[PDB]
Protein backbone atom coordinates (compact mmCIF):
# COMPACT_ATOMS: atom_id res chain seq x y z
CA UNK A 1 0.00 0.00 0.00
CA UNK A 2 2.76 2.45 0.89
CA UNK A 3 4.62 4.47 -1.68
CA UNK A 4 5.69 7.99 -2.56
CA UNK A 5 2.50 9.57 -3.92
CA UNK A 6 0.17 12.15 -2.39
CA UNK A 7 -2.08 9.57 -0.79
CA UNK A 8 0.43 6.91 0.24
CA UNK A 9 3.72 8.78 0.68
CA UNK A 10 6.00 9.43 3.62
CA UNK A 11 3.52 11.64 5.49
CA UNK A 12 1.14 8.63 5.61
CA UNK A 13 3.57 5.89 6.60
CA UNK A 14 3.15 6.41 10.35
CA UNK A 15 -0.40 4.98 10.21
CA UNK A 16 0.84 1.51 9.24
CA UNK A 17 4.33 1.92 10.84
CA UNK A 18 4.05 4.07 14.00
CA UNK A 19 7.85 3.97 14.54
CA UNK A 20 7.88 6.52 11.71
CA UNK A 21 7.58 9.12 14.49
CA UNK A 22 10.26 7.43 16.59
CA UNK A 23 13.37 8.64 18.34
CA UNK A 24 16.01 7.58 15.75
CA UNK A 25 14.45 7.85 12.29
CA UNK A 26 16.30 8.38 9.02
CA UNK A 27 17.23 10.19 6.88
CA UNK A 28 18.37 13.39 8.61
CA UNK A 29 19.90 16.70 7.59
CA UNK A 30 23.65 16.65 8.26
CA UNK A 31 24.55 20.07 9.67
CA UNK A 32 28.26 20.13 8.85
CA UNK A 33 29.10 22.83 11.38
CA UNK A 34 27.46 20.94 14.28
CA UNK A 35 28.84 17.47 13.48
CA UNK A 36 31.79 16.88 15.79
CA UNK A 37 35.04 15.31 14.70
CA UNK A 38 35.42 12.11 16.70
CA UNK A 39 39.12 11.11 16.82
CA UNK A 40 38.21 7.76 18.37
CA UNK A 41 36.46 6.64 15.18
CA UNK A 42 38.47 4.08 13.23
CA UNK A 43 38.94 4.20 9.45
CA UNK A 44 36.19 2.38 7.64
CA UNK A 45 37.13 -0.98 6.14
CA UNK A 46 35.25 -1.65 2.89
CA UNK A 47 36.33 -5.11 1.68
CA UNK A 48 34.48 -5.83 -1.56
CA UNK A 49 37.11 -7.77 -3.56
CA UNK A 50 35.19 -11.06 -3.24
CA UNK A 51 31.69 -9.67 -3.80
CA UNK A 52 29.34 -12.01 -5.68
CA UNK A 53 26.44 -10.13 -7.29
CA UNK A 54 23.41 -12.22 -8.19
CA UNK A 55 20.40 -10.35 -9.55
CA UNK A 56 19.08 -6.89 -10.37
CA UNK A 57 15.44 -6.30 -9.37
CA UNK A 58 12.64 -3.75 -9.61
CA UNK A 59 10.82 -4.02 -6.28
CA UNK A 60 8.23 -1.31 -6.88
CA UNK A 61 10.01 1.35 -4.82
CA UNK A 62 13.63 1.22 -6.11
CA UNK A 63 15.86 -1.08 -8.12
CA UNK A 64 18.39 -3.20 -6.24
CA UNK A 65 21.39 -5.36 -6.96
CA UNK A 66 21.51 -8.41 -4.69
CA UNK A 67 24.60 -10.24 -3.45
CA UNK A 68 25.43 -13.67 -2.07
CA UNK A 69 25.55 -13.06 1.69
CA UNK A 70 25.81 -16.79 2.61
CA UNK A 71 29.53 -16.22 3.39
CA UNK A 72 31.87 -13.41 4.51
CA UNK A 73 32.65 -12.20 0.98
CA UNK A 74 31.89 -8.47 0.73
CA UNK A 75 32.04 -6.98 4.22
CA UNK A 76 32.04 -3.63 6.02
CA UNK A 77 34.01 -3.30 9.27
CA UNK A 78 35.68 -0.60 11.35
CA UNK A 79 34.59 3.01 11.53
CA UNK A 80 31.89 3.17 14.21
CA UNK A 81 31.10 -0.51 13.83
CA UNK A 82 31.72 -3.44 16.15
CA UNK A 83 32.01 -6.69 14.27
CA UNK A 84 31.49 -7.74 10.70
CA UNK A 85 28.66 -6.65 8.41
CA UNK A 86 27.89 -8.52 5.19
CA UNK A 87 26.76 -6.79 1.99
CA UNK A 88 23.22 -7.90 1.10
CA UNK A 89 22.19 -5.45 -1.63
CA UNK A 90 22.51 -1.92 -2.93
CA UNK A 91 19.80 0.34 -4.29
CA UNK A 92 19.23 4.01 -5.05
CA UNK A 93 16.85 6.88 -4.32
CA UNK A 94 16.50 9.65 -6.90
CA UNK A 95 14.51 12.63 -8.05
CA UNK A 96 12.39 13.88 -10.91
CA UNK A 97 14.92 16.73 -11.35
CA UNK A 98 18.60 17.02 -10.53
CA UNK A 99 17.96 19.29 -7.53
CA UNK A 100 16.28 16.60 -5.44
CA UNK A 101 16.47 12.87 -4.88
CA UNK A 102 18.77 12.25 -1.95
CA UNK A 103 17.40 11.20 1.42
CA UNK A 104 20.14 12.63 3.57
CA UNK A 105 20.91 16.31 3.04
CA UNK A 106 24.06 18.29 3.77
CA UNK A 107 23.37 21.74 5.22
CA UNK A 108 19.89 21.32 3.69
CA UNK A 109 21.44 20.63 0.25
CA UNK A 110 19.72 17.84 -1.69
CA UNK A 111 21.70 15.73 -4.17
CA UNK A 112 20.28 14.20 -7.34
CA UNK A 113 20.34 10.70 -5.91
CA UNK A 114 21.68 8.58 -3.07
CA UNK A 115 23.21 5.09 -3.20
CA UNK A 116 22.61 2.74 -0.24
CA UNK A 117 24.88 -0.26 0.27
CA UNK A 118 23.06 -2.39 2.83
CA UNK A 119 24.97 -4.64 5.24
CA UNK A 120 23.91 -6.78 8.19
CA UNK A 121 25.73 -7.77 11.40
CA UNK A 122 26.75 -11.41 11.18
CA UNK A 123 26.50 -11.86 14.94
CA UNK A 124 22.72 -12.06 14.38
CA UNK A 125 22.92 -14.81 11.77
CA UNK A 126 20.31 -13.57 9.28
CA UNK A 127 18.99 -10.21 8.12
CA UNK A 128 15.50 -10.76 9.53
CA UNK A 129 16.97 -11.16 13.01
CA UNK A 130 19.36 -8.26 12.46
CA UNK A 131 16.51 -5.86 11.67
CA UNK A 132 15.21 -6.49 15.20
CA UNK A 133 18.44 -5.18 16.76
CA UNK A 134 19.64 -1.60 17.34
CA UNK A 135 23.00 -2.47 15.74
CA UNK A 136 21.69 -4.99 13.22
CA UNK A 137 22.44 -3.16 9.96
CA UNK A 138 25.01 -0.73 8.60
CA UNK A 139 24.10 1.26 5.51
CA UNK A 140 26.84 3.02 3.58
CA UNK A 141 25.28 6.08 1.91
CA UNK A 142 26.85 7.78 -1.09
CA UNK A 143 25.58 10.96 -2.72
CA UNK A 144 25.23 11.33 -6.48
CA UNK A 145 25.68 14.65 -8.27
CA UNK A 146 25.15 15.21 -11.98
CA UNK A 147 28.25 15.95 -14.03
CA UNK A 148 30.71 13.51 -15.54
CA UNK A 149 29.65 9.93 -16.07
CA UNK A 150 30.52 7.20 -13.57
CA UNK A 151 31.98 4.37 -15.68
CA UNK A 152 31.35 1.82 -12.94
CA UNK A 153 27.60 2.56 -13.01
CA UNK A 154 27.07 2.05 -16.72
CA UNK A 155 26.59 -1.72 -16.55
CA UNK A 156 23.70 -1.01 -14.13
CA UNK A 157 22.13 1.72 -16.28
CA UNK A 158 22.28 -0.39 -19.43
CA UNK A 159 20.15 -3.23 -18.00
CA UNK A 160 17.36 -1.11 -16.46
CA UNK A 161 15.27 -1.31 -19.65
CA UNK A 162 14.86 -5.03 -18.83
CA UNK A 163 13.39 -4.42 -15.34
CA UNK A 164 11.10 -1.49 -16.12
CA UNK A 165 8.20 -2.60 -13.90
CA UNK A 166 7.61 -3.95 -10.41
CA UNK A 167 8.49 -7.62 -10.02
CA UNK A 168 10.89 -7.82 -12.96
CA UNK A 169 14.37 -9.21 -12.31
CA UNK A 170 17.44 -10.21 -14.33
CA UNK A 171 20.72 -12.04 -13.92
CA UNK A 172 23.34 -9.51 -12.81
CA UNK A 173 26.52 -11.47 -12.11
CA UNK A 174 30.13 -10.25 -11.85
CA UNK A 175 29.25 -6.65 -10.98
CA UNK A 176 31.97 -4.96 -8.90
CA UNK A 177 30.52 -2.42 -6.43
CA UNK A 178 33.97 -0.93 -5.84
CA UNK A 179 33.31 0.97 -9.07
CA UNK A 180 30.64 3.01 -7.28
CA UNK A 181 32.87 4.35 -4.46
CA UNK A 182 34.38 7.85 -4.32
CA UNK A 183 38.07 8.39 -3.62
CA UNK A 184 37.69 9.42 0.01
CA UNK A 185 36.08 7.37 2.76
CA UNK A 186 35.62 10.41 5.02
CA UNK A 187 32.18 10.00 6.56
CA UNK A 188 29.51 11.15 8.98
CA UNK A 189 27.84 8.60 11.25
CA UNK A 190 24.74 8.51 13.45
CA UNK A 191 22.23 5.91 14.76
CA UNK A 192 19.09 5.71 12.65
CA UNK A 193 16.54 3.61 10.81
CA UNK A 194 15.49 2.02 7.56
CA UNK A 195 14.14 4.79 5.32
CA UNK A 196 11.36 2.60 3.87
CA UNK A 197 8.80 0.50 5.73
CA UNK A 198 9.11 -1.07 8.22
CA UNK A 199 11.30 1.91 9.21
CA UNK A 200 13.00 -0.30 11.82
CA UNK A 201 15.44 1.48 14.14
CA UNK A 202 18.27 -0.93 13.41
CA UNK A 203 20.77 1.01 11.29
CA UNK A 204 24.19 2.51 11.94
CA UNK A 205 24.34 5.11 9.15
CA UNK A 206 27.71 5.82 7.51
CA UNK A 207 27.32 8.68 4.99
CA UNK A 208 30.31 9.54 2.79
CA UNK A 209 31.22 13.21 2.48
CA UNK A 210 32.48 12.89 -1.11
CA UNK A 211 29.75 12.47 -3.73
CA UNK A 212 30.20 10.50 -6.89
CA UNK A 213 29.44 12.18 -10.20
CA UNK A 214 27.06 10.56 -12.68
CA UNK A 215 25.96 11.85 -16.05
CA UNK A 216 22.57 13.27 -16.93
CA UNK A 217 22.14 10.34 -19.34
CA UNK A 218 22.75 7.85 -16.51
CA UNK A 219 20.25 9.42 -14.09
CA UNK A 220 17.68 9.93 -16.86
CA UNK A 221 17.65 6.13 -17.24
CA UNK A 222 16.79 5.79 -13.54
CA UNK A 223 13.77 8.01 -14.21
CA UNK A 224 12.40 5.71 -16.94
CA UNK A 225 11.66 2.96 -14.42
CA UNK A 226 8.12 2.33 -13.19
CA UNK A 227 6.58 2.01 -9.74
CA UNK A 228 3.70 0.04 -11.26
CA UNK A 229 3.61 -3.53 -12.44
CA UNK A 230 3.30 -4.32 -16.13
CA UNK A 231 -0.17 -3.65 -17.48
CA UNK A 232 -1.01 -0.92 -14.94
CA UNK A 233 -1.17 2.86 -15.53
CA UNK A 234 2.40 4.05 -16.06
CA UNK A 235 3.65 5.91 -12.97
CA UNK A 236 7.30 6.87 -13.31
CA UNK A 237 9.65 5.75 -10.52
CA UNK A 238 10.87 9.22 -9.56
CA UNK A 239 11.14 10.98 -6.18
CA UNK A 240 11.39 7.72 -4.25
CA UNK A 241 13.05 9.46 -1.31
CA UNK A 242 11.94 10.08 2.26
CA UNK A 243 12.58 13.64 3.52
CA UNK A 244 14.79 14.50 6.46
CA UNK A 245 13.41 13.51 9.88
CA UNK A 246 13.90 15.15 13.29
CA UNK A 247 17.33 14.57 14.77
CA UNK A 248 15.94 14.45 18.34
CA UNK A 249 18.44 13.21 20.92
CA UNK A 250 21.25 12.31 18.51
CA UNK A 251 24.72 13.53 17.61
CA UNK A 252 26.22 13.20 14.15
CA UNK A 253 29.95 12.43 14.37
CA UNK A 254 32.50 13.15 11.63
CA UNK A 255 35.46 10.88 10.90
CA UNK A 256 37.49 13.81 9.58
CA UNK A 257 38.56 17.31 10.55
N1 LIG B 1 6.93 -3.68 0.78
C1 LIG B 1 8.42 -3.75 0.89
C2 LIG B 1 8.95 -4.99 0.23
C3 LIG B 1 10.25 -5.56 0.87
N2 LIG B 1 10.83 -4.61 1.86
C4 LIG B 1 10.40 -4.82 3.29
C5 LIG B 1 9.16 -5.71 3.46
C6 LIG B 1 8.31 -5.28 4.70
C7 LIG B 1 7.54 -4.13 4.62
C8 LIG B 1 6.77 -3.74 5.74
C9 LIG B 1 6.80 -4.49 6.90
C10 LIG B 1 7.59 -5.64 6.98
C11 LIG B 1 8.35 -6.04 5.88
C12 LIG B 1 12.36 -4.61 1.77
C13 LIG B 1 12.98 -5.86 2.49
O1 LIG B 1 12.34 -6.84 2.63
N3 LIG B 1 14.35 -5.76 3.01
C14 LIG B 1 15.12 -4.49 2.81
C15 LIG B 1 14.80 -3.61 4.02
C16 LIG B 1 15.53 -2.21 3.86
C17 LIG B 1 16.89 -2.16 3.67
C18 LIG B 1 17.51 -0.93 3.54
C19 LIG B 1 16.73 0.23 3.59
S1 LIG B 1 17.53 1.84 3.46
N4 LIG B 1 16.64 2.65 2.30
O2 LIG B 1 18.90 1.59 3.01
O3 LIG B 1 17.42 2.46 4.78
C20 LIG B 1 15.38 0.16 3.80
C21 LIG B 1 14.77 -1.07 3.90
C22 LIG B 1 15.03 -6.94 3.73
C23 LIG B 1 14.20 -7.37 4.99
C24 LIG B 1 14.33 -8.69 5.48
C25 LIG B 1 13.60 -9.09 6.59
C26 LIG B 1 12.76 -8.20 7.21
F1 LIG B 1 12.04 -8.58 8.28
C27 LIG B 1 12.63 -6.89 6.71
C28 LIG B 1 13.35 -6.49 5.60
ZN1 LIG C 1 17.73 3.21 0.76
Computed structural class: mainly beta
* Element pattern in H and E: HEEEEEEEEEHEHEEEEHE
Main beta-sheet strand count, sense and barrel state: 13 strands, mixed
Number of domains: 1
Round the Cα radius of gyration to an integer and report it. 17 Å
Beta fraction of the residues?
25-35%
- Helical stretch tally: 4
Present as ligands are: ligand U6V, zinc ion
Distance N to C terminus: 44 Å
GO molecular function: arylesterase activity; carbonate dehydratase activity; cyanamide hydratase activity; zinc ion binding
Subunit structure: Interacts with SLC4A4. Interaction with SLC4A7 regulates SLC4A7 transporter activity. Interacts with SLC26A6 isoform 4 (via C-terminus cytoplasmic domain).
Protein name: Carbonic anhydrase 2
Enzyme class: lyase
Defining key terms:
binds zinc ion, mainly beta, binds the ligand NCCCN(CCc1ccccc1)CC(=O)N(CCc1ccc(S(N)(=O)=O)cc1)Cc1ccc(F)cc1, two-stranded parallel ribbon, 15 strands, globular, 257 residues, 13-stranded mixed sheet
Task: Describe the protein in words.
The chain is mainly β. It has one domain. The protein contains 4 helices and 15 strands. Strands 2, 3, 4, 5, 6, 7, 9, 10, 11, 12, 13, 14 and 15 form a 13-stranded mixed beta sheet that branches. A two-stranded parallel sheet has the order 1-8. Strand 4 (53-58) and strand 5 (63-67) form a beta hairpin. Residues 59, 116, 118, 127-128, 131, 139, 194-198, 203 line the site of ligand U6V.
